[PDB]
Design a protein around this ligand. Structure first.
Ligand code: CLA
Ligand code: CLA
Ligand code: CLA
Ligand code: CLA
Ligand code: CLA
Ligand code: CLA
Ligand code: CLA
Ligand code: CLA
Ligand SMILES: CCCCCCCCCCCCCCCC(=O)OC[C@H](COP(=O)(O)OC[C@@H](O)CO)OC(=O)CCCCCCCCCCCCCCC
Ligand SMILES: CC1=C(/C=C/C(C)=C/C=C/C(C)=C\C=C\C=C(C)\C=C\C=C(C)\C=C\C2=C[C@H](C)[C@H](O)CC2(C)C)C(C)(C)C[C@@H](O)C1
Ligand code: SF4
Ligand code: SF4
Lengths: 40, 75, 142, 31, 75, 69, 729, 80, 40
């Protein structure tokens, strides 16, 4: 529905969705490649 | 709080005999000790159909489980 | 012959002694060994821990430079997309409502265009619409 | 060697003078 | 009604995490030698060190909420 | 000079919109010290603590405003 | 009511607030009723006389009490094994245990232990017996009397200076540079040559025989004939024992450099040539400004001539602005004094001048902390009184388009870029600290981000330190700078390369992090002070702040609320950041020097890269003996320090009550108490002369800040003294 | 007592007069605004300085200001 | 409460005056002065 679409696009939902995506990216990358202190 | 401060100063001045301590001027909670004694005697006559006290915090034996104390009198 | 107080971790007795007991960070049991072999390249102090040198030399460019460009690109991306989205919103007859309720189509459209932020930034600076004149900005009384 | 009683007493007597002068200065500044 | 639903979700979550990610079955056999534990940590950036040994070959966070004793008293 | 549907810049030197751009809502006859009425997009600080918004209109004299359009 | 006589607005106040504000505005001579400029300047002159006399009396009292109840004559026989004594203790409230605990340093009664490091100073300058100390105390009493009488005298109608006399900048600068600085330095050099050096070489010299004892075998002949090198021949050898004639040379002016082998301090002859040279330079400098002979520069033309096409009017009309504004001068003096005090601390912990003072670690730590805190206070005061100047004595038309008015033109840019640099420091510094803490806590301390302080180590190398192996400038023997035949190089290089002193201490990643944290603190405190000073004139929220004075409560809850909007409130906020920055500074210094003195630099080097090491290895570890000052089992000599530690921890908390709770609550409570007193029998016979009211908002902020600062200072002083005394004292 | 001053940007909206709880302000005919009325402060000796008049003023910055000065019993709002 | 310094009796009389006598004296004098309604 239109109202659900508008509610999903409010500021808190967007910022938390972006934060979850970024956190997932970082956690997965550190799962596969940990202990990266510098570019070798 | 002035009791605590007075004790602190007396201890700092090397005068432990002027403190509010059990080895010095004593402030004994006589009413609390009396009610503890009353509740310890409750299983006897005041609550005759009770086998033991409501809690051993008031007094009695030291209930210990395994190697640790479960509950003992709290003076 | 620089860093006479620093030694490579490969021949540092303290680092070598303490590197056989590295903890496994992840579920992979080889993470400790991988960290131990990867940290042997850097320079260790007497405490056995690696150190970073940021004097500007390119031999240690991995310590600061490569991450510096890596961070700066992303930060410029974020700032540029945010600024461009704000500027585009400013002409919609209700910018505040579109500031709390994000225009997701326009938002993602601006997201996908941020990889060219240095070229866009220099073009804006040359075109003169990147920076406003001091006479057009509100200022508090002196 | 350590000081004498007369030395301390003379120090007190000497310090009497700056007390009087400071009293006069404070009264003058109060005006 | 909404707050009741939230509390129900919390309680059901506690029971689920005590059923799947806990050593309650192991602790029940040896209650005096095994520490209660119902939170287990993913090893990602070294937080697997938090999964300390709680006895009986189980690694996890020791819990002090007392759910294990309540469950044993509940049959 | 200033009239309906205008775009002017403030030079009050103590107004909230000093250097800002406002629109001339209307002007009135003589005998008024500050006859020009100017409204602004941004609101000022006017209002009690915790107020949702402020005020986006004011009165100015003809010498305190410069034409932009 | 009479008090306060200088403000009729306060004198007609029926409440007790009149008693408070009367004290607060007492020494604010500018706002007094019926005050003229001439009277203002004369009263300030007399008050400055009074402060000088107070300083002299304080020094005299220190000398007298040390001579009377101290162990100066015993201390000089063994400076490395006998505790100096500050003053005797006479406390009827004491008990037997305290009397036994405080009978220390070989005394026969309860007594304190001096930590001001004045015994070393008196030993170095020459005085060795109690009679000399007593004579000094009496002479300082006489000096204080003379200055008090002078303050009285230049207040009489026949001696009150004119306003034109006060505004004479050129003559004041000439006299206070050639005379106050140069002549005093020359006299101190003469004292060192004629008395201090012979006394340190064993030859006793005093008022009785200084007229027949030549400081040098060749008297005034080489000096007058230009053969000055004679005075530098035969210096003190490395085997010289202070105060004796073993290994003592005859040179009175040398350039040995480095430190004395025995006292670990600078050579006295080096101090002599130093103060003599700076005396000559100051005397030359004091002949610059034109006073009465046509020759000499005039400050106004110099200021007005240094214009610029970029800054507009440059330094035009600044002479009038500075001369006619006492607050501008006070701010300049305070800033300079704060910078100089910081310099004194930094160059005095690393370059000790007094004999056997580097081995008394407690006094060194106390001196550094004391003078650094003084410098912080002065630096805050400079900005505060500069903001006062902007509020009161700044004339925009006179300073139109010059540097002073042009500062307010790009003040928004100033505050913006200063906010950016403060945020940039704080974010990425706290991030590194938290990263190291988290990674260490997870059992993997090898992933810590450790940045070597490359630039500071390069500077140390350029000054001659060869540990880092940079081989640059003075560390490079092939470079020209190390091949100039400077007389100080062989000694200075020996001193810096030794690891037994604080001269250019070795550094690591922890020092890098803590220096960047100190930079964050400095930039943030400067941000607060500068923003307050620039916005004191006015801002968007209050365009007419200048009409409301320097210190006012607020503008009410209207316009969104205006709590803490005055410049005084900006100073009030900046004081907390000053205290926090000083705390960081002193914690770093103290921990580093504890490691240095104990020889366990490894502890600091390992544990200073994460905050938990700061918490555990420094605070928790070094508090073990302090809190045990008095114990259920007994009392030791650290009991007073434990008591003062708790006292500070209490006053600090008490300040929170004024800082958090505000006026209306206490006002209503006082209403209730007033009703209770008025309705109580046998108490209505007594009534207050002044209606009791709650403390005002600004007064409350000031009182809370005062309690806070006192608790802060007392707590840190107690902890530092107790920890160092237990560890080494 | 405090000083209440009213400047020429007043538009005769009476908000300051209504917001005054101690009846310090008043309205007097004027000719500089449409309302032909301006605020006045004839009873400043009763003002306490609550700044409600300043809070109610709608003009840019304020056409009315309160400067807190000598504190009397009336100004300090003391009931004892 | 004895000391081995010269004229040990001085703190026996000086400290009380600085402790009790002088503080009370200036306390009362200042209290009288601040409530002196003679002038303004
Ligand atoms: C390289 C192969 C690989 C493998 C084997 C896995 C496997 C897993 N991921 Mg994963 N992931 C990967 C790549 C991979 N991922 C990449 C490249 C990303 C970046 C977008 C992610 C982002 C990601 C997130 C954000 C999450 C997982 C989660 C999970 C676990 C739940 C199952 C799942 O994927 O559905 C769930 C997958 C998602 C919700 C997002 C997947 C994004 C796709 C792959 C793109 C599972 C163990 C979830 C988990 O463990 O739950 C706590 C979880 O929250 N992953
Ligand atoms: C005072 C601060 C300071 C500053 C600002 C710099 C700045 C710089 N140093 Mg450096 N340096 C310093 C102190 C400083 N240094 C000190 C104290 C030492 C002695 C240890 C050195 C020793 C040093 C060496 C040995 C080298 C540098 C180099 C460089 C440059 C690297 C170029 C780069 O990465 O950009 C590249 C950017 C992009 C590709 C984008 C850079 C301009 C390098 C250089 O000269 O490069 C020309 C180099 O090899 N530095
Ligand atoms: C009941 C607590 C108590 C009391 C009353 C005292 C009292 C005293 N102690 Mg003491 N002490 C105590 C506990 C106490 N102690 C404890 C627990 C310890 C730790 C074991 C010590 C350790 C100790 C040491 C080590 C020493 C003392 C000393 C002293 C004496 C200092 C002389 C003095 O105050 O004049 C001076 C008065 C002042 C400096 C006033 C300062 C405070 C005021 C408020 C500041 C002034 C503010 C303002 C400008 C005032 C305006 C003017 C005013 C008149 C209105 C004094 C007799 C010293 C001593 O005997 O030498 C004389 C000393 O060396 N004490
Ligand atoms: C030779 C002439 C002469 C001399 C000696 C002085 C001296 C002084 N004048 Mg001055 N004055 C003069 C001519 C002179 N004046 C003339 C001609 C005029 C009119 C134009 C004035 C007008 C004038 C005014 C209007 C005032 C003074 C004041 C003062 C006093 C300020 C206190 C001070 O600076 O000392 C203390 C400071 C020093 C001695 C030097 C500062 C410290 C240096 C910079 C660094 C530290 C050195 C060293 C490391 C520290 C010691 C360490 C040791 C303790 C271990 C000082 C005694 C003030 C006052 O009221 O005093 C009564 C004042 O307000 N003067
Ligand atoms: C600035 C303070 C000061 C003062 C008051 C003195 C005072 C004195 N010094 Mg002395 N001295 C000083 C600084 C000072 N000195 C310094 C900085 C040095 C450099 C190391 C010396 C080096 C020195 C030597 C080497 C000798 C003295 C001697 C003397 C005594 C007599 C000679 C004299 O000075 O008449 C000066 C008379 C003149 C006519 C000089 C000309 C006028 C000038 C330019 C002013 C006299 C007590 C001599 C002594 O003990 O008795 C003979 C002696 O042998 N002094
Ligand atoms: C050379 C030094 C100097 C001089 C001459 C002045 C002079 C002046 N200052 Mg200034 N100031 C200075 C340094 C100086 N200041 C420093 C270093 C700071 C930073 C803290 C300030 C901060 C400052 C502010 C924030 C203000 C002034 C103001 C003023 C003016 C009048 C008010 C006043 O000072 O008296 C009145 C002073 C007081 C009432 C202070 C009493 C508080 C006491 C000293 C606290 C004591 C604590 C307690 C006793 C501890 C007990 C310890 C015990 C428990 C052991 C006056 C022109 C005021 C102004 O604008 O007037 C024009 C003003 O608002 N100054
Ligand atoms: C430890 C306490 C603390 C901290 C962290 C700060 C931090 C800050 N103060 Mg502050 N301040 C404090 C105590 C503190 N203050 C006290 C006691 C006073 C005395 C009243 C002041 C007085 C004061 C003044 C007067 C000013 C500041 C300013 C600043 C900022 C300067 C930037 C900086 O230093 O680092 C950068 C900031 C940080 C490192 C803090 C951010 C840390 C968090 C954890 C980052 C992550 C966000 C987090 C994940 C969000 C989660 C939310 C969610 C869980 C709900 C910053 C926000 C100045 C300012 O505004 O500068 C622009 C300024 O003008 N403060
Ligand atoms: C400011 C300097 C100073 C200070 C802080 C002290 C501190 C002390 N003295 Mg002391 N004294 C000093 C100078 C000083 N003395 C001088 C110059 C003399 C020579 C006259 C003496 C002679 C003296 C004697 C004979 C005795 C003390 C004693 C004491 C102790 C008891 C408290 C006291 O002072 O009252 C008693 C002492 C006095 C009243 C002496 C007078 C104080 C001087 C002369 C005036 C100082 C005025 C000062 C600058 C005012 C500052 C104003 C400020 C608050 C705004 C205490 C440790 C007593 C002691 O040892 O007990 C253990 C003791 O018996 N003092
Ligand atoms: C290690 C410390 C590094 C951080 C310290 C501060 C960083 C901030 C520096 C920003 C530059 C400020 C704008 C320069 C200010 C500016 O450009 O003014 C213009 C000025 C040119 O001066 P004029 O010749 O106009 O006149 C100078 C005087 O003779 C009188 O104006 O440029 C300089 O003097 C640059 C040096 C300023 C210092
Ligand atoms: C373009 C852009 C924007 C705006 C950007 C603007 C307006 C920027 C303005 C910048 C200004 C005015 C000034 C900048 C100054 C930069 C300086 C002084 C850089 C100094 C660099 C140094 C000192 C380098 C130091 C060493 C360099 C070397 C390579 C090694 O490491 C060692 C080491 C660390 C010593 C936003 C904010 C709108 C949005 C962004 O997304 C993009
Ligand atoms: S609130 Fe302001 S504009 Fe309205 S009548 Fe009062 S002073 Fe005039
Ligand atoms: S401050 Fe309060 S009492 Fe005074 S005029 Fe304004 S509204 Fe009335």
């Amino acid at each position: 529905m239109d109202g659900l679409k508008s509610f999903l696009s409010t500021a808190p939902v967007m910022i938390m969705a972006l934060l979850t995506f970024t956190a997932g990216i970082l956690i997965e990358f550190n799962r596969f490649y940990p202990d990266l202190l510098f570019h070798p | 709080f002035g009791l605590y401060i007075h004790n602190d100063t007396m201890r700092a001045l090397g005068r432990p005999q002027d403190m509010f301590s059990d080895t010095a001027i004593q402030l004994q909670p006589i009413f609390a000790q009396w009610v503890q004694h009353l509740h310890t005697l409750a299983p006897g006559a005041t609550a005759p159909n009770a086998l033991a006290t409501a809690s051993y915090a008031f007094g009695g034996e030291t209930i210990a489980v395994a190697g640790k104390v479960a509950m003992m009198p709290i003076t | 012959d620089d860093f006479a107080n620093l030694t490579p971790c490969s021949e540092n007795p303290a680092y070598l002694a303490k590197s056989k007991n590295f903890l496994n960070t992840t579920n992979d049991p080889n993470s400790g060994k991988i960290r131990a072999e990867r940290y042997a390249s850097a320079l260790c102090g007497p405490e056995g821990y690696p150190h970073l040198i940021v004097d500007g030399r390119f031999t240690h460019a991995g310590d600061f430079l490569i991450p510096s460009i890596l961070f700066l690109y992303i930060a410029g991306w974020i700032g540029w997309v945010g600024r461009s989205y704000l500027i585009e919103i400013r002409e919609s007859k209700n910018p505040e409502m579109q500031e709390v309720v994000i225009n997701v189509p326009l938002a993602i459209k601006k997201m996908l265009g941020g990889f060219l932020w240095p070229l866009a930034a220099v073009g804006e600076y040359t075109s003169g619409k990147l920076v406003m004149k001091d006479s057009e900005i509100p200022t508090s009384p002196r | 060697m350590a000081l004498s009683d007369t030395q301390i007493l003379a120090a007190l007597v000497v310090a009497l003078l700056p007390a009087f002068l400071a009293f006069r200065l404070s009264t003058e500044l109060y005006k | 009604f909404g707050h009741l639903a939230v509390v129900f979700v919390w309680l059901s979550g506690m029971y689920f995490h005590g059923a799947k990610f806990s050593n309650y079955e192991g602790w029940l056999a040896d209650p005096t030698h095994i520490k209660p534990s119902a939170q287990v940590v993913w090893p990602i950036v070294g937080q697997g060190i938090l999964n300390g040994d709680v006895g009986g070959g189980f690694h996890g966070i020791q819990i002090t909420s007392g759910l294990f004793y309540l469950w044993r008293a509940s049959g | 000079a200033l009239n309906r549907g205008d775009k002017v810049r403030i030079k009050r030197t103590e107004s909230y919109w000093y250097g800002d751009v406002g629109t001339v809502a209307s002007v009135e006859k003589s005998g008024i010290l500050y006859p020009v009425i100017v409204r602004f997009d941004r609101v000022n600080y006017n209002g009690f603590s915790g107020s949702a918004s402020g005020v986006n209109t004011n009165n100015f004299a003809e010498n305190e405003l410069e034409l932009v359009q | 009511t009479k008090f306060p006589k200088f403000s009729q607005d306060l004198a007609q106040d029926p409440t007790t607030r009149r008693i408070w504000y009367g004290i607060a505005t007492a020494h604010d001579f500018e706002t007094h009723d019926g005050m003229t400029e001439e009277n203002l300047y004369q009263k300030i002159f007399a008050s400055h006389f009074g402060h000088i006399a107070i300083i002299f009396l304080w020094t005299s009292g220190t000398l007298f009490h040390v001579a009377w109840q101290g162990n100066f004559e015993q201390w000089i026989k063994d400076p490395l094994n006998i505790r100096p004594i500050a003053h005797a203790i006479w406390d009827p409230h004491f008990g037997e245990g305290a009397v036994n605990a405080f009978t220390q340093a070989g005394a026969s009664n309860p007594v304190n232990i001096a930590y001001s490091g004045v015994y070393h100073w008196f030993y170095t300058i020459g005085m060795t017996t109690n009679q000399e100390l007593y004579s000094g105390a009496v002479f300082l009493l006489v000096l204080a009397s003379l200055f008090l009488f002078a303050g009285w005298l230049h207040l009489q109608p026949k001696f009150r200076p004119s306003l034109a006399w006060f505004k004479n900048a050129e003559s004041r600068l000439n006299h206070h540079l050639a005379g106050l600085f140069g002549v005093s330095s020359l006299a101190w050099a003469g004292h060192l040559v004629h008395v201090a050096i012979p006394e340190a070489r064993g030859q006793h010299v005093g008022w009785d025989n200084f007229l027949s004892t030549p400081p040098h075998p060749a008297g005034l002949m080489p000096f007058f004939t230009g053969n000055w090198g004679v005075y530098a021949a035969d210096p003190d050898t490395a085997g010289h024992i202070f105060g004796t004639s073993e290994g003592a040379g005859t040179a009175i002016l040398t350039f040995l450099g480095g430190f004395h082998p025995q006292t670990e301090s600078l050579w006295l002859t080096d101090i002599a040539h130093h103060h003599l040279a700076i005396a000559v330079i100051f005397i030359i400098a004091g002949h610059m400004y034109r006073t009465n002979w046509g020759i000499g520069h005039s400050i106004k033309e110099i200021l007005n001539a240094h214009k610029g096409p970029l800054t507009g009017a440059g330094h035009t009309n600044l002479y009038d602005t500075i001369n006619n504004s006492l607050h501008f001068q006070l701010g300049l003096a305070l800033a300079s004094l704060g910078v100089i005090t910081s310099l004194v601390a930094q160059h005095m912990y690393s370059l000790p001048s007094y004999a056997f003072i580097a081995q008394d670690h407690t006094t060194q730590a106390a001196l550094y902390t004391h003078h650094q805190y003084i410098a912080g206070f002065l630096m805050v005061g400079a900005f505060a009184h500069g903001a006062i100047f902007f509020v009161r004595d700044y004339d925009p038309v006179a300073n139109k388009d010059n540097v002073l008015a042009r500062m307010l033109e790009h003040k928004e840019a100033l505050i913006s870029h200063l906010s950016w640099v403060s945020l940039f420091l704080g974010f990425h510094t706290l991030g590194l600290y938290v990263h190291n803490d988290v990674v260490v806590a997870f059992g993997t301390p090898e992933k810590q981000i450790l940045i070597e302080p490359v630039f500071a180590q390069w500077i140390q190398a350029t000054s001659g330190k060869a540990l880092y192996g940079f081989d640059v400038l003075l560390s490079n023997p092939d470079s020209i700078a190390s091949t100039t035949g400077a007389a100080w190089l062989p000694g200075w290089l020996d001193a810096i390369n030794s690891g037994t002193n604080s001269l250019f201490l070795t550094i690591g990643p922890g020092d890098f992090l803590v220096h960047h944290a100190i930079a964050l603190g400095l930039h943030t405190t400067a941000l607060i002070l500068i923003k307050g000073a620039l916005d004191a004139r006015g801002s968007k929220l209050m365009p007419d702040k200048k009409d409301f004075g320097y210190s006012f409560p607020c503008d009410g809850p209207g316009r969104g609320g205006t709590c803490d909007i005055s410049a005084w409130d900006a100073f009030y906020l900046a004081m907390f950041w000053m205290l926090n920055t000083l705390g960081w500074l002193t914690f770093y210094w103290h921990w580093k020097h504890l490691g240095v003195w104990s020889g366990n630099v490894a502890q600091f080097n390992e544990n200073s890269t994460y905050l938990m090491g700061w918490f555990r290895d420094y605070l928790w570890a070094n508090s073990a003996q302090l809190i045990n000052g008095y114990n259920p089992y007994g009392v030791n000599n650290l009991s007073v320090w434990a008591w003062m530690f708790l006292f500070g921890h209490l006053v600090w908390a008490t300040g929170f009550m004024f800082l958090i709770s505000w006026r209306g609550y206490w006002q209503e409570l006082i209403e209730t108490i007033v009703w209770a007193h008025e309705r109580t029998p046998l108490a209505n016979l007594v009534r207050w002369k002044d209606k009791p009211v709650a403390l005002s908002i600004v007064q409350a902020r000031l009182v809370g800040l005062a309690h806070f600062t006192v608790g802060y200072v007392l707590t840190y002083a107690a902890f530092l003294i107790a920890s160092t005394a237990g560890k080494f004292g | 007592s405090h000083s209440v001053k009213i400047y020429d940007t007043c538009i005769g909206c009476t908000q300051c007069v209504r917001a005054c709880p101690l009846d310090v302000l008043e309205m007097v005919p004027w000719d500089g605004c449409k309302a032909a009325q301006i605020a006045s402060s004839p009873r400043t000796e009763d003002c306490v300085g609550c700044k409600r008049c300043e809070t109610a003023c709608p003009t840019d910055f304020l056409s009315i200001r309160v400067y807190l000065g000598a504190e009397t019993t009336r100004s300090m709002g003391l009931a004892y | 409460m004895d000391g081995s310094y010269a004229a040990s009796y001085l703190p026996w009389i000086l400290i009380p005056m600085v402790g009790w006598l002088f503080p009370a004296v200036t306390m009362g004098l200042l209290f009288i002065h601040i409530e002196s309604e003679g002038e303004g």
